[PDB]
Amino acid sequence: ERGYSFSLTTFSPSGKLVQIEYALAAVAGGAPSVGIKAANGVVLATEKKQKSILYDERSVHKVEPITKHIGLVYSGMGPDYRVLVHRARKLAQQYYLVYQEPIPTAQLVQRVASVMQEYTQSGGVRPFGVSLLICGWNEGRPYLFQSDPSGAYFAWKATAMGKNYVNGKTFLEKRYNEDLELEDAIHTAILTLKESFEGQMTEDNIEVGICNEAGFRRLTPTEVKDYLAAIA
Amino acid sequence: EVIELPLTNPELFQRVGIIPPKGCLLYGPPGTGKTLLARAVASQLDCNFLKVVSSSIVDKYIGESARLIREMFNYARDHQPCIIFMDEIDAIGGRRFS
Amino acid sequence: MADGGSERADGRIVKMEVDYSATVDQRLPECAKLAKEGRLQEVIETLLSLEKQTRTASDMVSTSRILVAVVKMCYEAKEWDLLNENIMLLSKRRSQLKQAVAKMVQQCCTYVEEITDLPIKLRLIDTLRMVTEGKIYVEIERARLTKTLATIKEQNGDVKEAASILQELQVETYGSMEKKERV
């Protein structure tokens, strides 16, 4: 068959791209998320909620490992997340085949952003509807990055995304600093996620990921319950 | 259970400690018997029973449309056991415009 | 339906006396499913009356032996369960449990002259958990008064019995009582 071969994203009379704005508006309605780094590693926290008790909470995951030391979380549309995850895995594989070394974080961020940008200029397609957070630990210094449906990216110390992201950023403004440890970072991440959380926070509604110079991994529900207790 | 019982055996609800509902609406697709039900109730329940279609209580003079409603509720208040049935209330109950 | 149960009753009236209470279980289903029918206004009530008479006869025979307290509780719980499985409100609009409770009350008041702890105190605990419903309010009164009176006379004591009798604040509320008895 064939496609259409004409761009669906065009310039308005006021010099603005409408579709990117609508994609950002769709992103703003997703599940909230928070990300922090303090001098030793990075913490990614996200909130998950099944509609009823029928759903199995251990069947799918939000935090996904690209490789041994890169982590990624999302906010926005659901199905579009897997395509980006799969593409990132492929890209890391070609990099490792060519150079025989684990990929640096910045290169992976740049390549993923390039794909996401290219997806808004071709013909007969519509842009993605997610916003990503990427974390890693290479050569000692930890790294945190955030993407954008338009393809741009930034580097952050602490970031909040999803619903009520403005309140999260203001809250992090008066709390975060440049010298803490991973445990206190976890404490403040749960504290700031409690701002818009549900009535009762259980050990299964929350997913937490930690990166240190030992590798990326996803916290099991037991220690998540341990952290939820003795706090708040 | 709503219109017949608390009209004739009122102390039960007093004992339990509640006041019975005042009214209910019948809804559903066309032709499923909504008027036939009210005809049967009217024919086989001994009470006082006013019955009107809401489309025909309107007229062009400046205030009659509200006066008539005040009149019919006064009439019901004087004749103490009574039922008000009025049909097709979407004719006047519509959402209020801006 | 109606006369088939009469024939079965006239048949097993002797069998129950000759046999043990196990056949009661064998006679439990066939009557209970009849309450499922409920096709006529008075057949089901007479049926359940016959079966309640059978249950009270078995209770008398059992409490005559050591099966006084350990099996009466099972009897009452099973009859409540049979009501649950059959139509609610005990099969029909008629209480169809009022007669059972009244007969058991008569047995408690008169037959158990030797009111040992298990024969009377336990039987009252069992029968006072049918208190909640309105249909049988009058009996739960008489039973409450009898319980308090027995406790007072036999053991003396005080305060607790007074508290028990007071809690029947519905004495005023009960419509269908003789005025003098209320007084």
């Binding site: 809250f171 008066k174 709390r175 504290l191 | - | -």
Partner: protein, 52 residues
């Protein structure tokens, strides 16, 4: 930092310790500061009674 309730608690504690040491003006001033800093809390479910 973020925490404001603990500020209310310690302010009330200083109010109590000044009052027990028989220094009325400073105790009243500390209580006033605690009241001002306790008016912005979303809900002090039990602390409100102690303050009052």
């Amino acid at each position: 930092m973020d925490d404001k309730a603990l500020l209310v608690e310690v302010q009330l504690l200083e109010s109590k310790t000044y009052h027990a040491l028989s220094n009325l003006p400073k105790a009243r001033a500390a209580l006033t500061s605690a009241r001002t800093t306790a008016n912005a809390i979303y809900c002090p479910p039990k602390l409100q009674a102690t303050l009052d």
